[PDB]
Ligand binder design. Structure first.
Ligand SMILES: Cc1cc2nc3c(=O)[nH]c(=O)nc-3n(C[C@H](O)[C@H](O)[C@H](O)COP(=O)(O)OP(=O)(O)OC[C@H]3O[C@@H](n4cnc5c(N)ncnc54)[C@H](O)[C@@H]3O)c2cc1C
Ligand SMILES: Cc1cc2nc3c(=O)[nH]c(=O)nc-3n(C[C@H](O)[C@H](O)[C@H](O)COP(=O)(O)OP(=O)(O)OC[C@H]3O[C@@H](n4cnc5c(N)ncnc54)[C@H](O)[C@@H]3O)c2cc1C
Ligand SMILES: NC(=O)c1ccc[n+]([C@@H]2O[C@H](COP(=O)([O-])OP(=O)(O)OC[C@H]3O[C@@H](n4cnc5c(N)ncnc54)[C@H](OP(=O)(O)O)[C@@H]3O)[C@@H](O)[C@H]2O)c1
Ligand SMILES: NC(=O)c1ccc[n+]([C@@H]2O[C@H](COP(=O)([O-])OP(=O)(O)OC[C@H]3O[C@@H](n4cnc5c(N)ncnc54)[C@H](OP(=O)(O)O)[C@@H]3O)[C@@H](O)[C@H]2O)c1
Lengths: 446, 446
């Protein structure tokens, strides 16, 4: 009568449900499942909302996604080994689908699987405690539909609440006096809000690349992006420059370590996120910066201090969807008794070996290869379909080259699926001109 | 060795500490105090921040206040009976001080009292449980300076976390397609962000009045405000009209029940707040809409289901600072044994009588007079200095008339202090021209 709690119904929660459902379909007897989700529908980040800051129930808004967002890597690198792009759409499609298209895809797997019935939507997880005496977890949640706080007992808990939602938002001198809008990447919604405007983007990783690109694409007057350590280093459009870092601000201007300075309408902090778990105490709470190998997680997923608690997708992401699968399948097999955990000492020693290797990594290539090795090790222990990881590494490599070649057109290239073998078609419209981000617009043919 | 927890160091928390400190100064022996505050300094709403949505630790941003905010009622109606405006500033000042000026004042009382030492700043209250077996509260908090979650036992808890922070944010058809900024009043920061723009304000209470006024004052091209029930009904500037309710929106336009419609750059939801206490379970959690008499609070402050738990300032606010005092002094005397509570049945019957009367109220005059009667009933039970409530009522009445006379110049009038008798000077600058909101600018003379 063993009972499991899954926190969150994004890709990771969906993957954990899907892993149990698959074991059950092959005839295994599975635990009882309850998955709690604070939004009204599944998909995690991929469920777009116009809302900003706090949602209609007062929970922090979860999604950081914006209008016009498109896959940032090759779809071929994030394809499910058990539910192909061919199966879901019935036809080839280009390699960088818009948000709505990938949303549709991940829902499709879990619609086929019938796992929606396990999910209590509109329910925020408030608190998870472990009771020593009974060896079980009390999960306290708030049901916003009924406006009730209640709690329930579980034998295992799988946490899938992500780490790209709680913004890291550093302060800069003068922000209290600046007259334009200051916002974090997290609150970016429609690029059209910045048409004909000068937009400062603080930071130099994916958010900066892509939020700049959208502002450019939808007609901002000018873009300044500044970096803390090293410049992003791509060849930008003519109305976009990189400066060394922002140092202060006044009523209208920004000042850089350059010595330069200029008039700026809006500042967008593209400074990343914190791992933040307001519902866990120190006995259960993961503390880490964003990285390929957070400590304290055996095989990157079992909580070393209480191996009945698990974390999915808490690593930085080169791979994503099929990493979460590998992780969710491993957790499932641990929970189900198919893969007994070693002692605490051996877990720590294993994790340390993973951390030593992580610290070796210099180049982007070495990094996704490392995540690949990690994933390889996971999928080899479970009935998760194996797939060509070295060939996925190669596809990441091409993608890197395409971005270096030209940062504004990398989305116009195509790659071959490592599940099906088929090469993807070019898209009916080049990126810069595809102004409509809808599923409908992308799947027809204008 | 009796121990009290005070949740929040805004005006209410500050009042609660001040109430204890005064009893102690007069020679009483007081309980031990710990006050928890998630911000880095005291003042509550009055502590301005440029931050929006979630703060640097990932907590919801608390303050709803914006640049250029000024007192919305006569300072004479919110004067402390035990720490006058004369005492704090050393000289007369006008009747509608800017935010920074009132912040300075409320901090002044609590700096004089030396109560800062009781407060653990940068600490978010996560959870408050009541243990039946020991009859005490476990308060769990997260210290963001040390990044540690810990908990502590208390005999009484006073909740002062406010109810104008978690926004009520209704959805309107088309919001997911609109191309400008959508925001709640709560996120409104610098009016200059809307200079030369058309701004729709949804709502018809104080937020709508005042945010519109600031947008106007700082040079917005045009203002549309729309109402759900009745229009605000003031004579607005020429570039500002009131329409019946908003019904939908597309890429660039708003459509109203008017039948009318127009191009709009930014939508500001001025639709109020919810009472939200994510750190309480249903045994302790107050559930109410914003009103003069929330139910379940004996004398408006003692939690009827567990009278060792208290709420300060959870009523809607005509009076404010000296209401919180009256309430804090009452809670103090209850906690200290000077005012024993009646049985549960009598509390309920008393609360019912207050509710019946609340439901009687029609006119704005009847409403603040009701709050005044409530405050009268409180201050008569404690050593809180009594003061002229009927004369404060009269002052509110004048203020109402000044607003109806001209909504854009009500802040240029002056009233007499009910603590000192002295009439307040006119201000060195009329409202529409005082563009600088700083303490310094308001307290010197230009
Ligand atoms: C702007 C942005 C763009 C991205 N684009 C890509 C991309 O193009 N390609 C790619 O591979 N990856 C991308 N990512 C990476 C992203 O992390 C993954 O794609 C994927 O969404 C990870 O999903 P997850 O389920 O682990 O967490 P999430 O997707 O964040 O979902 C977590 C779920 O947990 C829920 N939750 C959180 N707290 C609670 C609580 N208290 N109670 C109940 N429920 C809770 C949330 O509501 C949410 O549904 C992007 C990330 C961001 C932020
Ligand atoms: C925009 C705006 C303008 C206003 N203008 C006026 C005015 O001009 N005149 C007037 O009389 N009234 C005004 N008010 C009314 C306001 O409610 C009172 O003036 C007063 O600030 C109420 O104080 P409070 O201490 O009860 O709550 P607050 O002032 O809101 O302070 C609550 C405190 O609780 C803390 N807190 C909340 N949650 C936690 C947690 N979980 N853990 C730790 N700490 C927590 C917050 O950090 C905050 O410091 C205004 C309100 C708003 C929103
Ligand atoms: N579809 C898309 O294209 C898309 C868009 C956004 C996000 N994402 C996803 O989200 C993940 C990362 O998002 P992210 O770019 O927001 O965070 P991130 O990858 O951790 O990058 C954080 C960035 O902010 C900078 N930064 C931090 N503090 C700073 C400071 N005080 N001053 C100046 N700069 C500062 C960092 O500077 P330093 O470099 O000096 O450390 C770094 O460039 C990616 O793995 C991707 O999956 C995808
Ligand atoms: N210094 C200042 O001037 C200042 C500024 C802001 C706030 N404050 C303080 O904050 C308190 C109130 O702030 P508030 O005005 O934001 O909230 P509020 O007083 O409760 O008013 C809520 C408003 O939003 C409207 N509304 C709610 N739902 C709506 C919907 N679905 N569609 C359209 N309109 C809708 C309500 O409509 P209905 O009228 O139909 O009920 C009402 O006008 C005041 O007591 C004051 O202390 C002061």
């Amino acid at each position: 009568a063993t009972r499991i709690a899954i926190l969150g119904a994004g890709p990771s929660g969906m993957a954990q449900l899907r892993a149990f459902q698959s074991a059950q379909e092959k005839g295994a007897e599975i635990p009882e499942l309850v998955c709690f989700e604070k939004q009204a529908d599944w998909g995690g980040q991929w469920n777009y909302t116009w809302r900003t800051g706090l949602d209609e129930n007062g929970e922090p808004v979860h999604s950081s996604m914006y209008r016009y967002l498109w896959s940032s890597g090759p779809k071929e690198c994030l394809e499910f080994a058990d539910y192909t792009f061919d199966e879901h759409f019935g036809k080839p499609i280009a390699s960088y689908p818009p948000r709505e298209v990938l949303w549709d895809y991940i829902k499709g797997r879990v619609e086929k699987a019938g796992v929606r019935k396990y999910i209590r939507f509109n329910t925020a997880v408030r608190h998870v405690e472990f009771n020593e005496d009974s060896q079980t977890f009390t999960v306290t949640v708030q049901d916003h539909t009924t406006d009730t706080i209640y709690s329930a007992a579980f034998d295992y808990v799988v946490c899938c609440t992500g780490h790209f939602s709680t913004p890291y938002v550093p302060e800069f001198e003068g922000f209290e006096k600046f007259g334009g809008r200051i916002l974090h990447a997290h609150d970016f919604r429609d690029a059209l809000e910045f048409k004909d405007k000068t937009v400062l983007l603080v930071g130099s990783s994916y958010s900066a690349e892509d939020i700049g690109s959208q502002c450019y694409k939808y007609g901002a007057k000018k873009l300044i992006s500044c970096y803390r350590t090293a410049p992003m280093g791509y060849k930008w459009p003519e109305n976009w420059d990189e400066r060394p870092n922002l140092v202060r601000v006044d009523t209208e201007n920004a000042y850089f370590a350059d010595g330069s300075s200029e008039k700026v309408d809006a500042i967008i902090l593209c400074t990343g996120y914190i791992h933040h778990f307001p519902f866990l105490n120190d006995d259960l709470r993961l503390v880490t910066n964003n990285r390929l190998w957070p400590l304290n997680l055996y095989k990157g997923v079992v909580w070393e201090d209480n191996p009945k608690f698990f974390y999915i997708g808490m690593q930085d992401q080169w791979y994503s969807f099929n990493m979460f699968d590998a992780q969710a399948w491993y957790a499932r097999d641990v929970i189900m008794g198919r893969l007994p955990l070693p002692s605490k000492e051996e877990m720590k020693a294993d994790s340390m070996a993973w951390r030593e290797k992580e610290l070796t990594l210099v180049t982007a290539e070495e990094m996704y290869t490392y995540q690949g090795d990690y994933i390889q090790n996971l999928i080899d222990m479970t009935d998760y379909p194996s797939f060509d990881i070295p060939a996925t590494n190669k596809t990441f490599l091409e993608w890197k080259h395409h971005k270096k070649e030209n940062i504004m057109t990398f989305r116009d290239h195509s790659y071959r699926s490592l599940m099906t073998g088929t090469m993807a078609p070019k898209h009916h419209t080049p990126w810069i001109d595809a102004l409509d981000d809808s599923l409908e617009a992308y799947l027809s043919d204008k």
